[PDB]
Design a protein around this ligand. Structure first.
Ligand SMILES: N[C@H](CC(=O)O)C(=O)O
Ligand SMILES: N[C@H](CC(=O)O)C(=O)O
Lengths: 227, 227
């Protein structure tokens, strides 16, 4: 049977919610033996991703990712890292451990190709600084980049609201204002913590915003993707 | 840093919710590097626990638990199995793999000693048949056992409602009626799926019922228990 391995804890709140999403979107028909097999390493003790970018101890962070990829390579058939920012480590990791990896950057890119409309990349300054989406996406011309001022406001939303488990709907007004400002009906979850907002919107039946949210997509399409 | 290993997927819905509970009840102060480190094996492909009791393939089920305990023994400092029923396998597993194990039966027993009032064991027929609580708890005289008719109604709640992810509050009326019938203000989560009801009650501020719910307790007391 096909096993998904999640290297998560980045942050833990969204890591936990992602696991809920998997079984929410893959309900069983008769017996729960049908349902997805998943291994989660929720290690919040990973050194902060955006924090490690402003240090010589990117090295420390890349080691974290490498050792845990070694462990999960032995245990899982596909792997996901529960942080977009964290994908910056991948050029330093040997090609063999990235064999099973399913990139959140690539998943985002596939969705955006199908959607084919300008879309606002909501992400941390560190994700922006590492230019993961602009360098990684075939659809980069459809990505609207936040200004530096708005990047910091998003960083503030992620850390002061979403990572601390507060109601993701509490930032919806600020987000509609950004979408309205940058003149788009659509966002990319450049930070995985926007999985939490994506869920709260779907739950509330707000279908006016189009979320390109890789963790949602991985959950929805678990049967097809994991083999 | 201290790592909790969860052998779960039994069922997956409650396994996912338990991981949410851990970070809900252990919010970080400044940085999320503070937060709990957890490994989850959510394998719903485990053969049904109550189902395996009515077969010669208890053997198949005990092997599942043993191999996964071997894996988690190498990776974690404490282990929990996310099924009460599943604890029936433990007499067959060698003492060395049970070193790190934190029994849900024992955790329930500790809580009930402190509470010290008659309490209704809500559980599957298979948990009842294996007599895990009556044989395992020092406080067994405080446990009120369901009749066989009511055991089947609970089995129906677990499988038709809670395991399929439906609103745990949808069974609250039926549960108040059982507590009222057996003349008590208190239940034991003999099935782990009653973690889901315990959460939905705490969220709704219903403090009239006292839940002896081991997964809640493990989450609340993560710092103290995990070392
Ligand atoms: N939430 C992660 C960054 C992190 O907090 O590690 C991301 O995808 O951007
Ligand atoms: N939910 C489990 C039984 C199971 O479904 O495996 C229990 O604790 O009873």
């Amino acid at each position: 049977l096909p096993i998904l391995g999640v290297l998560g804890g980045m942050g833990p709140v969204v890591t936990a919610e992602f696991l809920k999403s998997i079984y929410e979107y893959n309900p069983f028909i008769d017996k729960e033996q049908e349902s997805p097999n998943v291994i989660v390493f929720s290690f919040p003790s990973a050194p902060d991703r955006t924090g490690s970018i402003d240090s010589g101890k990117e090295r420390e962070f890349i080691d974290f990712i490498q050792v845990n990829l070694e462990h999960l390579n032995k245990l899982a058939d596909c792997i996901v890292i529960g942080s977009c920012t964290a994908h910056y480590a991948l050029p330093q990791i040997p090609e063999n451990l990235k064999d099973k990896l399913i990139s959140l950057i690539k998943i985002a890119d596939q969705e955006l190709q199908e959607y084919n409309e300008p879309t606002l990349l909501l992400a941390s300054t560190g994700t922006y600084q590492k230019k993961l989406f602009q360098e990684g996406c075939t659809t980069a011309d459809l990505i609207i980049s936040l200004s530096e001022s708005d990047q910091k406001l998003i960083h503030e939303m992620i850390y002061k609201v979403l990572k601390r488990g507060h109601d993701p709907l509490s930032i919806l007004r600020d987000i509609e204002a950004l979408l309205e400002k940058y003149n788009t009906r659509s966002y990319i979850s450049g930070s995985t913590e926007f999985h939490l907002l994506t869920k709260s919107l779907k739950l509330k039946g707000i279908d006016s915003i189009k979320a390109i949210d890789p963790l949602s997509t991985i959950a929805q399409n678990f049967s097809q993707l994991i083999i």
